[PDB]
Design a protein around this ligand. Structure first.
Ligand SMILES: CCCCC[C@@H](C/C=C/C(=O)SCCNC(=O)CCNC(O)C(=O)C(C)(C)COP(=O)(O)OP(=O)(O)OC[C@H]1O[C@@H]([n+]2c[nH]c3c(N)ncnc32)[C@H](O)[C@@H]1OP(=O)(O)O)SCC=O
Ligand SMILES: Cc1cc2nc3c(=O)[nH]c(=O)nc-3n(C[C@H](O)[C@H](O)[C@H](O)COP(=O)(O)OP(=O)(O)OC[C@H]3O[C@@H](n4cnc5c(N)ncnc54)[C@H](O)[C@@H]3O)c2cc1C
Ligand SMILES: NC(=O)c1ccc[n+]([C@@H]2O[C@H](COP(=O)([O-])OP(=O)(O)OC[C@H]3O[C@@H](n4cnc5c(N)ncnc54)[C@H](OP(=O)(O)O)[C@@H]3O)[C@@H](O)[C@H]2O)c1
Ligand SMILES: Cc1cc2nc3c(=O)[nH]c(=O)nc-3n(C[C@H](O)[C@H](O)[C@H](O)COP(=O)(O)O)c2cc1C
Ligand code: SF4
Ligand SMILES: [Cl-]
Ligand SMILES: [Cl-]
Ligand SMILES: [Cl-]
Length: 671
């Protein structure tokens, strides 16, 4: 029912079965023990389920281009068997795969990093070495070498990565390129590197080889490029020999969100659409395309010739086969949380997925029939229970999922109500449908007791959490409201608010209470307006002259925490800054190193910088953490019954949804 999505594309010398490309994703397996074998199975499954063309994670052409010391690299015929193992696994399934050639430029977290000029990145501790003319020529030959090897390894093509602020991208902008050389100055010299790279690659591999160039169409940084430059380069790259041009949005330094959940679906399709007609090469659009209808609509509307989807393939390898068979409701949607994927590879760990713990770990987490069937009982329909339930039932076990609420979801029913997190609705729709599919007997409105119902071979407690009630003097005062009272029970909240407890929930509560109106997470034009994106792309880096336009918060909010470190420091590495910037632009205040005296009619008495203060607030919201709820933990052990604890009722400290699901999933696959 997605005609455009599944239409073949003729590339002259070969054909792609459909218009879907699995976007490049550095998984961290590239430079891992048995990565070759794990990536092979990782990719084969996506190819087995329809992906027309896959683009591997970025791989360095030389040594100065790696991402982190010891990073993935392809510069020796010796590494061919590695990749051969991968291309062959994909080909056996009837798919295709291209290798991305990426040189991280001034972004590599390594001392020997090289760039067009000696200009330190705002997010890198190292100062790059300004490349010399002869070094650049060698790099250009290195890219060709890289492609030669990829082709030898059996890849269907390569992607020359010229965006996100990496090396090639850096040569293009005057923000990073200040050379007086022939590789700097006017735009014609600045393009020289990108064009020369693709031209050297084309010559080296011949005509029958797919060459993708990921063009940066929206830098999102001061002194970035203009649309006129974007167009000239695109046509230049076409003439250089590229087969396909892919879209690149933003730089890592960009202070505007490009892939996180607050980013609306298909938020940047309009950008790729602006290039249409300026080149004859097929164009791929990307970012936050996680639904078959959205992708199909983008294609049918003519926004692009192909759509790229990276994270959705971590979330569900069967995304396309389900789409093509009318089972879109069974798609485990990527919610753009970045928690298990981007946040992890950023700290040098293997990427995974919050809703799919098996992502990039399918070989190490096999789903065997069933050691031997059993009649199980799961208490709690939160992500912990849900993950275990459908995974155990798909194994053959009989599962009975109980939950005191009128609907499955647990805390996710609160999370989904936070502006910029409505994507959570999808995960619940998915589990709701998978319950039916795997045969899980669901029983809602059931508050289970250690006695009431327990004739099960084994029990799996996935009960929740108990919000923390800080022992502050006057904690029962009328002004005091827990986060549940505000978020779940919609309790009235005055104009002036003090929030006790920063970190996760505290930030979401503040997002909610400061919401100026409708969320831009569902309004492309609004999102672009709030973040200062220039729709004409005529401004350098596509930044509107008037800058950001985040509305004022309808309320006066102050967030507080006792630790002295910067509030929000413990949030997700790639998403915390977004929320922090949003809140601060809305006028919310965040104060560290706070001591709470008491709560009375005068408000909230505290101590800041060693001086007492009275916060004349209309309400004090408690977001002071959680503690595990094990109500049935002992009543079950004191009843000689085998019981298991997963998710929040086992650990509440740093137990978010990822640990919850991975835990329930691990139990489910073992039991
Ligand atoms: C982004 C994580 C790396 C992923 C690598 C993988 C490839 C990924 C490709 C992609 O396209 S991912 C999608 C697009 N990119 C993103 O979404 C990332 C956006 N950026 C971020 O999330 C973060 O900035 C991140 C890079 C993760 C972390 O940065 P960090 O080290 O924690 O520092 P931070 O917390 O972000 O702080 C940066 C500080 O310096 C300032 N700053 C930064 N940029 C600018 C600028 N342009 N103008 C002015 N000031 C700036 C800030 O005011 C801030 O000050 P402070 O007081 O907080 O210290 S593997 C590559 C292998 O070769
Ligand atoms: C506003 C907000 C935003 C959040 N945002 C994020 C985010 O962006 N990312 C992330 O990873 N995590 C986030 N979390 C935490 C996330 O929602 C997970 O739900 C949590 O980490 C673990 O869920 P769980 O399955 O262990 O239990 P829960 O989701 O808490 O569910 C336990 C369930 O069992 C039931 N139960 C309890 N006792 C009994 C009993 N005696 N009988 C029957 N049923 C019982 C309840 O009905 C409840 O639904 C957020 C939480 C809130 C409140
Ligand atoms: N997806 C994401 O981006 C993301 C980001 C962050 C967290 N999470 C997860 O989502 C959940 C949200 O958890 P949470 O914020 O409610 O709890 P929490 O952040 O994990 O921990 C409690 C917080 O409240 C404060 N606090 C604790 N005891 C207190 C007391 N007695 N008095 C006053 N203040 C106190 C602490 O700050 P001080 O001690 O400094 O006062 C601390 O930051 C967690 O499970 C977390 O792992 C997800
Ligand atoms: C874990 C992870 C690794 C990524 N690695 C790369 C990479 O090596 N090269 C690259 O060009 N883009 C990389 N990206 C960016 C994706 O190619 C893509 O542009 C972005 O995630 C698109 O959003 P989507 O996931 O919503 O489709 C990565 C993204 C993630 C989440
Ligand atoms: S971690 Fe969140 S962002 Fe990453 S892939 Fe899974 S669901 Fe999407
Ligand atoms: Cl080298
Ligand atoms: Cl791992
Ligand atoms: Cl309810």
């Amino acid at each position: 029912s997605y005609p455009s999505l599944f239409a073949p594309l003729d590339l002259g010398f070969t054909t792609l079965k459909n218009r879907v490309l699995m976007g490049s994703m550095h998984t961290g397996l590239e430079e891992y023990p048995d990565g070759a074998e794990r990536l092979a199975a990782f990719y084969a499954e996506r190819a087995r389920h329809g992906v027309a063309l896959i683009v591997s994670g970025g791989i360095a052409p030389d040594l100065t281009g790696v991402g982190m010391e010891g990073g993935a690299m392809l510069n020796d015929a010796s590494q061919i068997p590695h990749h051969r193992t991968i291309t062959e696994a994909v080909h056996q399934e009837g798919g295709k795969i291209a290798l991305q050639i990426l040189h991280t430029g001034r972004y590599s977290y390594q001392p020997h990093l090289v760039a067009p000029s000696a200009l330190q990145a705002p997010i890198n501790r190292f100062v790059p070495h300004e490349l010399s003319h002869e070094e650049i020529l060698q790099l250009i030959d290195n890219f060709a070498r890289c492609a030669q090897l990829a082709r030898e390894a059996g890849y269907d093509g390569v992607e020359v990565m010229g965006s996100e602020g990496y090396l090639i991208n850096e040569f293009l902008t005057l923000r990073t390129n200040q050379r007086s050389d022939q590789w700097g100055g006017d735009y014609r010299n600045r393009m020289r590197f990108a064009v020369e790279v693709v031209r050297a690659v084309r010559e080296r591999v011949g005509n029958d080889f797919i060459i993708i160039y990921r063009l940066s169409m929206l830098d999102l940084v001061e002194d970035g490029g203009t649309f006129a430059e974007t167009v000239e380069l695109a046509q230049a790259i076409e003439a250089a020999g590229a087969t396909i041009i892919n879209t690149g949005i933003g730089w890592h330094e960009a202070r505007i969100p490009t892939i996180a959940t607050p980013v609306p679906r298909g938020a940047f399709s309009w950008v790729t659409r602006k290039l249409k007609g300026h080149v004859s090469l097929p164009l791929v659009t990307t970012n936050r395309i996680n639904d078959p209808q959205v992708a199909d609509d983008i294609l049918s509307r003519g926004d692009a010739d192909m759509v790229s989807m990276a994270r959705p393939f971590l979330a569900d390898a069967e995304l396309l086969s389900k789409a093509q068979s009318g089972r879109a409701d069974e798609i485990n949607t990527c919610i753009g949380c970045n928690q298990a994927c981007l946040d992890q590879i950023f700290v040098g760990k293997v990427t995974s997925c919050l809703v799919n713990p098996r992502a990039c770990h399918e070989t190490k987490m096999p789903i065997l029939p069933a050691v031997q069937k059993k009649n199980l009982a799961v208490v709690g329909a939160g992500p912990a229970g849900l993950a275990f339930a459908i995974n155990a039932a798909a194994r053959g076990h009989q599962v009975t999922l109980f939950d005191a609420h009128s609907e499955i979801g647990g805390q996710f029913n609160i999370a989904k109500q936070i502006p910029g997190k409505e994507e959570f609705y999808e995960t619940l729709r998915y589990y709701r449908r998978m319950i039916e599919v795997t045969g899980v007997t669901l029983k809602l409105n059931h508050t289970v007791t250690a006695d009431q119902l327990q004739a099960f071979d084994e029990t799996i407690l996935a009960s929740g959490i108990v919000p923390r009630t800080p022992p502050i003097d006057g904690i029962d005062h009328p002004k005091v409201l827990s986060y549940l009272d505000v978020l779940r029970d919609k309790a009235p909240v005055g104009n002036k608010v003090a929030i006790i407890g920063c970190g996760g929930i505290g930030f979401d509560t503040a997002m909610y209470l400061s919401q100026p109106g409708e969320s831009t997470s569902q309004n492309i034009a609004g999102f672009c307006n709030e973040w200062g994106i220039d729709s004409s792309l005529q401004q350098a880096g596509g930044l509107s002259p008037q800058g950001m336009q985040i509305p004022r918060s309808p309320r006066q909010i102050v967030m507080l925490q006792r630790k002295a470190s910067k509030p929000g420091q413990g949030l997700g590495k790639t998403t915390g800054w977004i929320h922090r910037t949003t809140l601060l632009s809305r006028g919310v205040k965040m104060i560290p190193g706070v001591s709470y005296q008491k709560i009375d009619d005068d408000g909230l008495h505290v101590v800041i910088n060693g001086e007492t203060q009275v916060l004349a607030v209309d309400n004090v919201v408690i977001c002071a953490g959680q503690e595990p709820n094990r109500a049935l933990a002992q009543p079950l052990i004191d009843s000689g019954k085998t019981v298991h604890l997963i998710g929040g009722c086992d650990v509440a400290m740093e137990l978010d949804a990822r640990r919850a699901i991975a835990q329930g999933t691990r139990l489910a696959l073992e039991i």
